[PDB]
Amino acid sequence: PLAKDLLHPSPEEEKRKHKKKRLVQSPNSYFMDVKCPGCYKITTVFSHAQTVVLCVGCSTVLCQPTGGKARLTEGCSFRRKQ
């Protein structure tokens, strides 16, 4: 240490750090589009969702809230955006 460059940290070091402790803070979360076999239209699900997102096209739940990341259901494909 003693000469660490704080203006240009490595992306690995930035990702390792706490979200609020980074040089410029960014969320660890993301939004996803989920494809369900019982539907065809796009529904955007937050990765850390707190509600039981429901499939409009069927009677299946889309994800279950957890302490952290939501528990995506089996058979529905999630694709993160951005």
């Binding site: 203006l7 992306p11 930035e14 410029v24």
Partner: protein, 186 residues
């Protein structure tokens, strides 16, 4: 068909409006420029043998313009050879109120009409397709500042040529040196 804000149309301003008046008909946006009106247009030298053209759009229409500006700009650069075309809004800066004052503005100055907010909005309109993902201000030993701007990495090779004109336009409008870069880290 322009509505100049300064009540004093110029030759190049009238010329730009005529080019727009054309587009309006012979184009794909008859359902666009109809109301998409501008207010002014300048042509400034950015450095060396190149120049650039700045189209001053009124604020409430900017979003509409921004919906089609990328399509519009591509044509105007075609219509003007090697001259980049930039859309920034006519944002007015109210002077900071002082104890020694006059009947300048009896009401509180809105934050959108402060110098810093207007300058930041000018920087954001200067680069419409590429977004601002990070800003730095390096205060150099002589006390002179230098703004370094990080842009989107996905639009890197399409706008890297537009550098040296964005800096020129910003230096003409706000009087601050600015640089643009594209960091590896997203």
């Amino acid at each position: 068909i322009v509505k100049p804000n300064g009540e004093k149309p110029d030759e190049f301003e009238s010329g730009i409006s005529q080019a727009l008046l054309e587009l309006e008909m012979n184009s794909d946006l008859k359902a666009q420029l109809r109301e998409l009106n501008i207010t002014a247009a300048k042509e400034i030298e950015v450095g060396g043998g190149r120049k650039a053209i700045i189209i001053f759009v009124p604020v409430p229409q900017l979003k509409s313009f921004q919906k089609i500006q990328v399509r519009l700009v591509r044509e105007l650069e075609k219509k003007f050879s090697g001259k980049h075309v930039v859309f920034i809004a006519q944002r007015r800066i109210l002077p900071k109120p002082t104890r020694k004052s006059r009947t300048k503005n009896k009401q509180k100055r809105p934050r959108s009409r402060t110098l810093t907010a207007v300058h930041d909005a000018i920087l954001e309109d200067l680069v419409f397709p590429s977004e601002i993902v990070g800003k730095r201000i390096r205060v150099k030993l002589d006390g002179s500042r230098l703004i370094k701007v990080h842009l989107d990495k996905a639009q890197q090779n399409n706008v890297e040529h537009k550098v040296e004109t964005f800096s020129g336009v910003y230096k003409k409008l706000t009087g601050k040196d600015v640089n643009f870069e594209f960091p590896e880290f997203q």
